[PDB]
Design a protein. Structure first.
Lengths: 274, 274
């Protein structure tokens, strides 16, 4: 009874109370010889989305070249040629809500038009505030991630909450309804390894803002820093972050390893009484 | 600064503050044609103890036939022929403290004489109270596990704490020092699947007794009940229990999958600030 509403996603509806929601990460695998839409590139995305669906994903998060982990400099024009064909094919062939991982308003707009249901913004409407106008107009959920162009904090948690509020204000001023706001602490962004640990340790503070929280820690550098393990050897590390996140009240986890993290989340949910 | 003493284990000393301690599970693989001590049987145990050492174990827990998971009916005379050669070889070849997983006083005595450092009692000194006299005499740590010959609880957590106190009283009356007492909630013993979940959910209550807590959930039936997965597919499930246990303050985890659980524990420790 924590949430008195469900997350409305067009033809899909996500219950926020019954289980931790698993968002599976789908990064584009660009064909070297085309700008987008080619069979090998799109077929790869579809096959991967189907696998994640079969492994327990509730949302498929689709990211083009300009987003994490690559951060390529690419025009919205180029970005649309690549992202839109993926959204079209995945939305047709995979019966799950799709999030578009972009900070660019025009990309978000075209993605929603192509069939995406949720906007996932690593800059929390601060890089391109018009993304909040797009969100409001289409009445879609938007995930506002904590992020900064600096790591000069006075007090990490207090600053994160203040920064997240600045994002909330941008979204609400644009007309985004409270029920369409989700927050993300931005673990692995604009934070030292030590600061990432401190944010994990204090994640429950985000709950005072009164919005659902999505945690995205999967395979991130700070896990490698602790364990001294490369990106492919971080299942256990990611797992610990997912478990602690759920214990601290997060509603979503954004993960690469859907099969394993879905099992861990299900076990956590059972134990905490979710 | 939670603990103002270290766990003294003869030539070994375990710090209770710096990391979650990993106890690796070693079950005997009985040779069919002998009562104990044979090369294949003991070599198997030694090889396994070395692997667990290399994978991050801090304690090796050695169990003969009459203990979990098999619970064979076997005389102390038979049990000694099997357990003592394992302890002798493992203690010589593997530089870690050894716990003997037995509820039988005479087995515990001979095990300590053979080189074991810690007594691990699934009956918490209630099946054979003389085991507490053995513990006191040799001045070794003893793990008192919650257990009952029934599941008729009036109130699970309150009953567990009362039962654990009855074990503490037996141990202290026998002369066991406070610094040599460790408690275990007995997840998977004398509890319904639902009760096991409830005990996990409320594990932090055990901390009021003021003794270190060891959690032993590895691969247990209740994980299979939640996930509907067989014993070999419970890494993720065990992982969630380990993470939640550490968050709730446990000092030890008793696990089969040392490599994976050691990594998860290290990540948890870093995040909680242990
Ligand atoms: O300290 C808060 C920073 C907010 C912020 N506004 C930005 C605009 C553009 C970009 C860029 F375009 F990605 F470079 C990054 C930004 N970061
Ligand atoms: O309800 C608390 C039960 C305490 C208890 N005393 C026991 C003695 C012997 C055995 C046995 F020998 F293993 F059967 C099991 C026991 N259980
Ligand atoms: O399914 C992947 C192949 C087998 C496998 N390796 C694992 C490592 C760690 C964990 C973890 F402990 F749950 F994180 C689960 C795993 N399962």
């Amino acid at each position: 009874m924590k949430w008195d509403y469900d997350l409305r996603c067009g033809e899909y509806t996500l219950n926020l109370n019954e289980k931790t929601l698993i968002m599976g990460i789908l990064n584009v695998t660009p064909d070297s010889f085309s700008d987008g839409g080619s069979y090998n590139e799109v077929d790869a995305a579809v096959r991967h989305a189907k696998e994640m669906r079969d492994e327990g994903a509730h949302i498929i998060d689709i990211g083009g070249e300009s987003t994490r982990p690559g951060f390529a400099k690419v025009s919205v024009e180029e970005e649309i040629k690549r992202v839109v064909p993926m959204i079209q094919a995945v939305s047709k062939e995979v019966k799950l809500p799709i999030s578009i991982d972009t900070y660019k308003a025009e990309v978000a707009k075209q993605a929603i038009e192509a069939g995406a249901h949720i906007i996932n913004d690593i800059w929390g409407a601060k890089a391109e505030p018009k993304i909040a106008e797009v969100a409001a107009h289409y009445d879609v959920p938007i995930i506002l991630m904590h992020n900064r162009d600096n790591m000069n904090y006075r007090n990490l948690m207090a600053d994160m909450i203040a920064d997240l509020y600045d994002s909330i204000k941008i979204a609400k001023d644009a007309g985004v309804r409270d029920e369409n706001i989700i927050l993300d602490p931005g673990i692995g962004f604009a934070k030292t390894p030590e600061q990432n640990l401190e944010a994990m340790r204090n994640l429950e503070q985000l709950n005072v803002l009164g919005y659902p929280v999505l945690l995205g820690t999967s395979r991130k550098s700070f896990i490698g820093h602790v364990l001294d393990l490369p990106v492919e050897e971080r299942l256990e590390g990611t797992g610990a972050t997912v478990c602690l996140g759920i214990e601290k009240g997060c509603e979503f986890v954004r993960v690469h390893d859907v099969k394993e993290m879905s099992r861990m989340a299900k076990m956590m949910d059972a134990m905490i009484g979710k």
